[PDB]
Amino acid sequence: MKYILVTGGVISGVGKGVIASSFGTLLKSCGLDVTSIKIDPYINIDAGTFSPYEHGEVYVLDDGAEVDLDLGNYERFLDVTLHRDNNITTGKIYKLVIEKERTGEYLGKTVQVVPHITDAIQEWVERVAQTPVQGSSKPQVCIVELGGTIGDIEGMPFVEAFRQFQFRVKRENFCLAHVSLVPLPKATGEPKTKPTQSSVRELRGCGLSPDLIVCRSEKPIGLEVKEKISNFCHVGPDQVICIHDLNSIYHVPLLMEQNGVIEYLNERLQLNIDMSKRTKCLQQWRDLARRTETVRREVCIAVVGKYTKFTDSYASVVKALQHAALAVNRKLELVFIESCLLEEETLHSEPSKYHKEWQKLCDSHGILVPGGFGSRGMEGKIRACQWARENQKPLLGICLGLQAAVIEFARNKLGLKDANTTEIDPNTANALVIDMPEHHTGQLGGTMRLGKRITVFSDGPSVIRQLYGNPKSVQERHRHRYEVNPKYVHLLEEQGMRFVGTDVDKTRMEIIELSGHPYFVATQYHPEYLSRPLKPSPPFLGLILASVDRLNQYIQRGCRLS
Amino acid sequence: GEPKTKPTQSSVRELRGCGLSPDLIVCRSEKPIGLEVKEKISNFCHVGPDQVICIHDLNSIYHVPLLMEQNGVIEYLNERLQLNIDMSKRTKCLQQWRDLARRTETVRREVCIAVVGKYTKFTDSYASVVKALQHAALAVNRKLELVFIESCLLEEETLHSEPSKYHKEWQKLCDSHGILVPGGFGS
Amino acid sequence: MKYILVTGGVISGVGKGVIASSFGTLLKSCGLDVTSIKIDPYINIDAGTFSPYEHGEVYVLDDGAEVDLDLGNYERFLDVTLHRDNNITTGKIYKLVIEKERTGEYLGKTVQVVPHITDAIQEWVERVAQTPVQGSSKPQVCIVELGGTIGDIEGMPFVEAFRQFQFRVKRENFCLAHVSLVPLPKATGEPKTKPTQSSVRELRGCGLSPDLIVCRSEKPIGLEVKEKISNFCHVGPDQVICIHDLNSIYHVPLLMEQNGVIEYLNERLQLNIDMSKRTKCLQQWRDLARRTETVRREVCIAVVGKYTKFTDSYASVVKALQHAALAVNRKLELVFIESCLLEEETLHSEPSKYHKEWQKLCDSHGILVPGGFGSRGMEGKIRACQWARENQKPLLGICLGLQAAVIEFARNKLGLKDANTTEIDPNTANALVIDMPEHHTGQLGGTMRLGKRITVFSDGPSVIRQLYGNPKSVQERHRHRYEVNPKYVHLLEEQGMRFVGTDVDKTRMEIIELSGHPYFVATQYHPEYLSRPLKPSPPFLGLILASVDRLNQYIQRGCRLS
């Protein structure tokens, strides 16, 4: 079995997830099973005890628990699924060693870091290899990647463990793909290659040998720069690959083919390949770019979030909008609006950025508000949700934001100003949204709704049911813990706020709709995880068509993409 | 593209259809024309070749006396009226018009002035207001940056109708540091 | 005596010369003598055997030989001079060690790197301190800097030697100013600081302790970034200084004053200071910016060089034009034109960039052609020089380019197509420019005209003589080796090409002028070295006034700046 190792480099955040994922989708279409193993050198859990919406997201995509967010790039371009055993953290390894010392496995003697830790990491590699995906036999090439930069203390036991794993097998059963960064300030001009020389020197100071020289830059360099890398890094002249800032994320496989580095992996691993045209399939990557960079209608999409610009807490949101806009020929035009700058305190302080966020939101025709962080910015989303229901503006709530929409409907339409959720102010007389935990078999205390959860529909004629083809039982991931109190839901039966989405026990509300509005759907799950370029998410298609008034003609034809 | 002179020919023909004779040919254009355009006016209007004056869209309003001096039409009025003139430098005073332009088109601090009025753009009901701000900004070296905000687009009825131009007028007003609201029209 | 040490960083070429020079010019006006000591870790000579016009220049500014180009930033903002003992290279140290071992100084025993090489470097520091500038007593604070990055082999003996020098003296008699770079790609957004954390870790892995945290960025950061590095670098919160891409080079002293880091050096070294306004003099740096960023006439200056953009071979040229344009209120507008793309071969190959370089040159009103590199691009400067003499265009030749102008005058005006210099084609019948070396006392073979050389004028009424105040003997640096043959100069006496600049023996021609042309001066020396913000170079003032027709009114008033 082959193994591809992708270590760190100068920077760890420029886009290393799509670089290692390009080699997996290139050999998957040829008839080779490719698996992914994520390594996290952080001491804390990658997503268990991590912050909700701050410096990351709770990446839950077909898994009983939660793993790192970097696993998203290894599933969209491919077609396989992963589990909790693929993501390995330093904190998880420290838990199993204590269980072995108490029972008695190391002959009662003390343990160190070698050969007491380098051998334990190799054991987890064999467990994932012998357990492939549902619908295969045995993987042939694996994609191993790790987080962080190079030279840190947390990354020392990983390099020492991988240096011995290649000696146990043959020479052609292991490779290395080192990714680096080539900075270039605007005040210098000349590509002064110096930080790249220090990154490849530390990797060779452990026992490894770089094979695939990956250098990230910002513009296509000439030929005088590659001649210096061949002698400074002491590698081959054809192993240096030039990578610059691409337009999107699907242009990575289209760049490695022009440089001529695909056939280098065949002569290094000594394997067979049954190609049709040129190496990988050309009837999928080239045809996808012909539906985006051509004719565009320029659709304006304005959403409200926590930060005024793009960051790491909105990574899975900007990627799902690109896969849903290419089907109807649209251009990605998204502006980030901070929810904290929409309250009355911001207007009395700095009114400069107050009306600026409202000017870009009123001109749009689509509202997609995700979730907030605690009670910071909850009053800002109320003023933006009360207008979408009055000016026939489409609105779609992913998660958490639904709790702020049910309270607004009880104040303007009904008239319950005292109604408030128990998370912000539990001391209230109208407990609309309370905390309803789940007590499963074997679990103690108040657990959180996350994992393999199946939801059941309720009503028949619904705009959200016809998108999936009129089913009867759909399974989707969840992460929310607060639910709607089934006591105050009797008042909403006489109004237009209908409940078309329940659970199994018919005691929790997830999908709700409003009568009379052309497009007002508010759900609780996350449709961006169950999306892919081969088949986008149905909920994200109804929001794009509603912004251009092309939704009524999609159901009459029979929904070609359901 | 080509300066097709035809509406001007009908304007100078109606004036000659009463008993008058055009002496000072004033032509308003948008860019400095060459020499082939003035040759047609000398025969179409049946006037002198030196009487045609080229006037284009100026930057302000005080650049009018500085344009007629370069064309050389000041001495034409002296030989037409047969009068005397006691000049010091060149025709008119040069220590006032040339020194005034040296305090405006030089260094500017870019001051943002946003006012609220009746129309969203310049019109005839705000002529004396835009002229008084130019004479007061040249003393402290400032650049004229004025934006018109409609008072009718600042109520609650505009927000419920078309909120596109509602917050746009507030964004340009909050960034400024000066409010000069004139008067409205009725209620 | 105090010593300020400025080590390397992540990158080597962003502008470390203007960073260390800010601390020298700030204490010089207060009444403290500041000296500069340059350390070059390169094995080859910094300018002795270095290439002429390729990856650097021959920096000769008041010195018997040549030193590194990085010493230019330490002399323009200040007012002192340096010698050959300030620049210390690794190749120069290896020459004196062999002489000491052959004679007998190390007791006959072998030598190593400690304590055999660390003590030899400290001896050169005492020799420069005891020999100050001409017109002082003894320096109090020194500025020690070194080239290259951090972590190289050539820089290891320098860090070990400087680590012990601070222990021989007191604690407050030595400091350290570590410079770093904070990259931020345009595809990330968040200031992911990681290469800076690795630069401060390698410096502390020897024995030094950073005191002045200098970080180079591209935009003013907030407050969440400074608090993050203080805990990683384990330094003080007030020691972190934010430096971004400035507009010019004189804005460095104006940035450190706003952050409030000037008084930190007083409490660290325990010295006295007699300030007038606020620390340094405010009647020089603030008044200089009021003559550049105000009213500009937008002058178009187009020159012909070797590269199409700015590089390291034209550093001293772009800095001298800024000091001469602020006196008459002008804006820096310079475009680089490659001389190789001006011949007939470029027109027959790629005519896209051929007429583009001529379009920006004809619209300008000033020609300042420096020197070429060998015989690559000599025919391109001939076509650009034959037009400046016919369309009354100002032309000024720095060096080497004069050889290509004297041949053009002999072909178009005279009629000697066979005339050619001996450097390109020595096999000719009209040896116009030959090689005339100089044989000084004690020197053998053919030497090169470089060092303390004094030139003598010839004619009286000249446009170049009145710029200096009508002298009689001027001293200037030189580097050229080829001279004009005194045999073929008799034909130029009957034409307008007069010789107003000779040497001592009246056998070499340097400054030549043309009769009838309004401004056509061609010299051989370099006026950009003898320039300073307090008094710019006279030759560069006659070229700016000729581009705007403001030169005839400068001599009538009596030349206020001569």
UniProtKB/Swiss-Prot annotation, chain B:
Record note on disruption phenotype: Larval lethal.
Chain segments annotated as transmembrane: none
UniProt note on tissues of expression: In ovary, expressed in oocytes, follicle cells and nurse cells. Also expressed in larval and adult testis (at protein level). In larvae, expressed in lymph gland, salivary gland, regions of the midgut, testis, optical lobe and trachea. Isoform 1 is expressed in adult testis, ovary, accessory gland and head. Isoform 2 is weakly expressed in ovary.
Role played: Catalyzes the ATP-dependent amination of UTP to CTP with either L-glutamine or ammonia as the source of nitrogen. Constitutes the rate-limiting enzyme in the synthesis of cytosine nucleotides.
UniProt family annotation: Belongs to the CTP synthase family.
Protein name listed in UniProt: CTP synthase
Organism (species): Drosophila melanogaster
Upper lineage: Eukaryota, Metazoa, Ecdysozoa, Arthropoda, Hexapoda
Gene name per UniProt: Ctps
